[PDB]
Design a protein around this motif. Structure first.
Motif, mmCIF file in Angstrom:
data_model
loop_
_atom_site.group_PDB
_atom_site.id
_atom_site.type_symbol
_atom_site.label_atom_id
_atom_site.label_comp_id
_atom_site.label_asym_id
_atom_site.label_seq_id
_atom_site.Cartn_x
_atom_site.Cartn_y
_atom_site.Cartn_z
ATOM 1 N N UNK B 31 0.873 -1.171 0.000
ATOM 2 C CA UNK B 31 0.000 0.000 0.000
ATOM 3 C C UNK B 31 0.899 1.206 0.000
ATOM 4 N N UNK B 56 -4.039 8.856 -3.362
ATOM 5 C CA UNK B 56 -4.326 7.527 -3.874
ATOM 6 C C UNK B 56 -3.157 6.576 -3.739
ATOM 7 N N UNK B 57 -3.451 5.281 -3.828
ATOM 8 C CA UNK B 57 -2.428 4.250 -3.716
ATOM 9 C C UNK B 57 -2.199 3.538 -5.052
ATOM 10 N N UNK B 59 -1.884 0.708 -7.828
ATOM 11 C CA UNK B 59 -2.763 -0.432 -8.129
ATOM 12 C C UNK B 59 -4.211 -0.214 -7.685
ATOM 13 N N UNK B 60 -4.639 1.041 -7.626
ATOM 14 C CA UNK B 60 -6.004 1.356 -7.222
ATOM 15 C C UNK B 60 -6.609 2.265 -8.269
ATOM 16 N N UNK B 61 -7.911 2.141 -8.496
ATOM 17 C CA UNK B 61 -8.560 2.962 -9.514
ATOM 18 C C UNK B 61 -8.238 4.442 -9.341
ATOM 19 N N UNK B 62 -8.137 4.885 -8.087
ATOM 20 C CA UNK B 62 -7.847 6.288 -7.767
ATOM 21 C C UNK B 62 -6.507 6.810 -8.312
ATOM 22 N N UNK B 386 -1.458 -4.481 -12.415
ATOM 23 C CA UNK B 386 -2.802 -5.055 -12.438
ATOM 24 C C UNK B 386 -3.767 -3.941 -12.875
#
Ligand code: G39
Ligand code: G39
Ligand code: G39
Ligand code: G39
Lengths: 387, 387, 387, 387
Positions: B31, B56-57, B59-62, B386
């Motif tokens: 994360x 945002x992090x 590998x996240x949509x954000x 991903x």
């Protein structure tokens, strides 16, 4: 202030479990660093577990392992002994694919080697900040201990090797105070080989038990006097402690020379007890599977084969690996001698297993004036992983 | 107490790897904050890595990146140098889409700029709490260093720019003690342009090497005396250090004016060594790919083209990016001079790569009186992720 | 030692962004506590963000929200202001579904209310350990501030309500030193209603601006003298600050009585500036969407409608919510007065949005003697989530 | 310095909620250690929650539970009370599948038992480093308290059992100062059985309420004088507190002997109040479902059945489990007596539930001179999990 560490090693009858990180099992779901060579060193406040990371986490594509050992991502980090090498409790030490660390009582001194094989560079950190540098002096993979260095009355010592893994190589002893190099020596050892030494302080001198990757089944030993004058050779004991190795039954111990035509090796340790010696070794004579420690009467100074104690810490049906030595600061133990402790690394995944990655756990053991029952504190992970 | 920082920069022959976070690789499973501009500043106890986050992090949509640079989510945070910019070891500094930070020896002073482009606001924090404010003075994206500010004997200094990215803009030097502004100056530099300065203390004066986003291929330089009196111009050296740029072969260096019709730029640094100068620059003359540092004899005060040293830190087959300067407090190094250190940001993902996000890693390098071998400590991540 | 906090509130012209956690966005991939009512309180070292958790994390089935507000899982926890309410950097405070906390300069005092609605119990913690207790005194949902309590010269004060949300209820003021209750009072306010007070110290007295859930569009106000003697009423200003509310154009302010037949409400704050007053309020007059703060000349003591300043912090196209007050310890600000600061909670998910969960972010703002430009520092999350 | 702990237990009328970790709910998405027996012990600074881990995390294949209790992965770790047993905020204590811990005022002393059942070893840690050892003295699962040990004026005491779970077994009391054993005793108790004692200091003597796994429905009790002289027996009260058990209506209390032919048991506690006694017990007389605590007048020294108080902490429709005792250091409470506190473990998953794993949460309760309303602070998790 500085840690004296001029006392003699405590005479122990067996060792008791200190800790166990269970990193790999935890790493199944947690965010654990895919690591290697998890050595332990202590400060006058706490003992930490140092390890090498490949910048990747377990169960992540980046753990593919196909990444070279001496890659540019290899960094040295640490955590309080027993804690898994997780991303959130880790501390950055130095950039390295071979390291060593020790606390002189005031600040932490780490030594990380990184760079090209032909011109690697070793950066000495102190207080969490680079202070000095050692450049490759032979253009062939500059490397070091992979376990705790040694600090006696302020000055810290460690051993490095620059040269081939097979034939002769060049070895040296560095000495440093407050992160800066104050002296060094070349170790004359023709026909002999030295790698990944496991050192500890004992009677104001630095005793190390190392690895012979050339032709040694018995392990080389080198007592270092505070003035860089020294003594080198092999563990006398008529019992082979390196892996791979042949049977003890065919081994005539030797105090000055390597024996057994075996050439490869694995990092081990040994603790002198007066004239006796506690030597550690994988149980398998060929695979890095199993871990045990034998006490050989007079084995530190005689081709003795007289075993007085044996204690298994990882049965022979479980993977073992590297192992190093360190000592409990007297400020933590409370004893008047330096308690002897070691760690056993437990390799999982490739090469012996069918997974795309490779890592290892560890268990820490310490002195103790009692006899501890045999048992197995193995890794426990369940391979293969989600991958 | 306060950090004197009145010493001269140490004369170094090369630099050694300090740290490497491997944030992006780790961020594959960990994360990790999708960040940018990871500059390093040190206190008399530790060096921390500051960075900008988009809330945002990885590998996240954000992490979609379509979010504007100067968005209202942009916050300034930090971690101990070498640690990835992970959510669990991070510290909140200030709300910003452009920042700077420095430690005067007692508390930490951060400066975060946020707000609308036409009326941005810069909040000065000290002790982890806002103390003073600087409002946009020209209504055009108020911005600052993106790297360590400078504190000499208690007073800290930093440079800001308010105006267009192309044509002229207005620049100023702010000075502050214990979080509160105690003075300021306007920098007269018509025809010249200043952005993202990389400053460091040297002989009781604040030396900065900046960026010319107007018409400069050579980098502007500005020595700041403790009384806000100052000196501005360009790195003399007959070698272009900004990116993009033309060939060195077609560059006639200039101490007072920009050269090369190139208009864009990238944040770099430079360290004066007596009269010589260590200048950093991407290897590619056009892409932000590759990083190297050359020592030009007399290059700080002469159109010298006489290169005395070269050391690559990121080969030209790898992405580079921003780079800044800072100094090791004498309380950490132990030297009698201020050790010069820098950081190289390594941009991954858009625009040069096919992923929906954009972030960067970094490697920290420091002074050292030895010559360090060339090598590449690049990011190492494997895109695409991903997603 | 104890924090004096006997100074007057600093006269500010606008507020500057202190922090922003971006918890919900981060919570998309991180392990963030599904929380609510994230108030801020400061110690003479740091300001922390307190919040209520439902024992569940964002993006987890356990965030279903169908769990009652006053459930037995509701615990009070905290983190350093600006940090998201993540599981790994959080600290356990007390078991509560309604709380308050303040630092007297030595230790932290938290107050968590939990238990059955008809016989709730409020446990006072001090030093991270329960010291005293307040049992429901009216058998109807014992509750408190939901924002920082107040400590002046060692003694800390806070206000509680026991009774119905509509009609009359019973209110009291508790006073305590070192975690133990040393006095209390009943607040006579027939026809009036008090809930979730936002208090702050000002001139050795505790000033609070609260919520009228009965019939108040203007907010009740209660100055508390160190001897529990007090003064209650409403914000005089001829402008409604509670939500929902009617137009300002139809509001005749009132210093002693509620106005507007609106009955519901929302937690807000207000800061007296001499005779003027900084009042906060959602932009929407009906929805908890938008946040702004107006300075009304003489509005603290007159039905004034004379607006001298306005600054939006969350535009009206974004969700707002609760908001509280606190002060910067003089030991952090350095000023000779108490800097006034507040926080705006930003509710996302149900009820206004189509997701199975409900949480909120926050932005912290502080005093400042400058005028800060309007802007929107809204949540930014992207609903719905993976769920 | 050392914690005196020579005061009498405070006379409380009820208990108030201290904390609640909500580990299992959190563990649905977080990285929480699949744990067990989460006892609480306090230092003169903080109270921590100790627990046993199986080296695995919730929602991970490694939580399969089929792993034996006394496996080699079992390690003792801790966190600040109220915090879930998460991987990132945890501290490694000792390797153990049965432990105990207490703080003497200076350093922490933990005792972890591990090894083979027939020759288990108990390692005493002090300062986060092994100091002494206790080997199995009867070759049958060497075990201990599973809850806080006791330190009075520097010396810490704890009780161990070596022998069968049914028939007679051998019990002993160990005493230690600064991690090293300074004395011990054998407890003569033929016909009696002792396991998992819940001890606390009271009037310079160590009072423990234990478990009878042989033939006891009433709980054995043993007052330990500082000189290892002691007193053993059973809680007099004419009311059964062990689980399983028969009706109170059929129980004739007994001060010297076990009663009820029930043989199994569960770990509980009890606090003497003068001559009265606060005894805890699962609500179900057969299942480990529900938790309550009754105050029996004169029940510490008489077959009294006179109940003066009852307070449920976990209703009977919810799973309960182990429960232990500890005391608030006077340095945290501020009282002149030792506040009595306990914890209730809440077992979820196998055996009573259909999931492949097994763990537990907990709620901590403390003294208090008020009467606290009944309620249920149960686990709350939603089984089954993703698995
Ligand atoms: C270069 C030879 C050296 C000594 C045998 O190899 C080591 C053996 C290793 C091994 O046998 O597993 C792993 C170490 N990572 C490696 N050291 C380096 C620097 O690569
Ligand atoms: C406004 C022009 C300024 C100087 C060139 O732009 C920077 C260039 C950047 C870049 O070239 O990558 C990124 C910085 N985030 C940006 N600064 C701001 C405040 O947006
Ligand atoms: C009991 C009435 C009280 C004051 C209006 O309700 C609050 C309103 C709330 C709200 O309007 O969002 C949320 C608070 N969690 C709640 N307090 C409690 C204790 O449940
Ligand atoms: C060996 C008998 C002992 C006392 C009844 O068993 C305990 C009962 C337990 C239980 O009833 O849940 C769990 C404990 N983990 C176990 N202790 C050990 C060392 O295995």
């Amino acid at each position: 202030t500085y840690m004296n560490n001029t006392e003699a090693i405590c005479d122990a009858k067996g060792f008791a479990p200190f800790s166990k990180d269970n990193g790999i099992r935890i790493g199944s779901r947690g965010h654990i660093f895919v690591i290697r060579e998890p050595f332990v060193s202590c400060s006058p406040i706490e003992c930490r577990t140092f390890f090498l990371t490949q910048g990747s986490l377990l169960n992540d594509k980046h753990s593919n392992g196909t990444v070279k050992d001496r890659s540019p991502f290899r960094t040295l980090m640490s955590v309080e002994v027993g804690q898994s090498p997780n991303v959130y409790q880790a501390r950055f030490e130095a950039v390295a694919w071979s390291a060593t660390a020790c606390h002189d009582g005031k600040k932490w001194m780490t030594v990380g080697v990184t760079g090209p094989d032909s011109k690697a560079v070793a950066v000495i950190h102190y207080g969490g900040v680079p202070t000095d540098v050692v450049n490759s002096w032979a253009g062939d993979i500059l490397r070091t201990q992979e376990s705790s260095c040694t600090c006696i009355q302020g000055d810290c010592y460690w051993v490095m090797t620059d040269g081939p893994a097979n034939r002769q190589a060049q070895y040296r002893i560095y000495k440093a105070n407050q992160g800066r190099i104050i002296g060094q020596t070349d170790i004359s050892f023709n026909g002999g080989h030295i790698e990944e030494c496991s050192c500890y302080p004992n009677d104001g001198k630095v005793e190390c038990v190392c690895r012979d990757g050339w032709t040694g089944t018995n392990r080389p030993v080198l007592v270092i006097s505070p003035d860089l004058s020294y003594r080198v050779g092999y563990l006398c004991a008529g019992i082979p402690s390196d892996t791979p190795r042949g049977e003890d039954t065919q081994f005539t111990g030797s105090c000055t020379s390597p024996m057994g035509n075996q050439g490869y090796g694995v990092k081990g340790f040994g603790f002198r007890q007066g004239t006796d010696v506690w030597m550690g070794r994988t149980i398998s004579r060929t695979s890095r599977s199993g871990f045990e420690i034998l006490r050989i009467k007079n084995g530190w100074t005689q081709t003795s084969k007289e075993q007085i104690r044996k204690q298994v810490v990882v049965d022979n049906l479980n993977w073992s690996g590297y192992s190093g030595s360190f000592t409990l600061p007297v400020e933590l133990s409370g004893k008047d001698c330096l308690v002897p402790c070691f760690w056993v690394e437990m390799i999982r995944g490739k090469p012996e297993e069918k997974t795309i990655w490779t890592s290892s756990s560890s268990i820490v053991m310490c002195g103790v004036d009692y006899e501890v029952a045999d048992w197995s504190w193995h890794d426990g992970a369940i391979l293969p992983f989600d991958i």
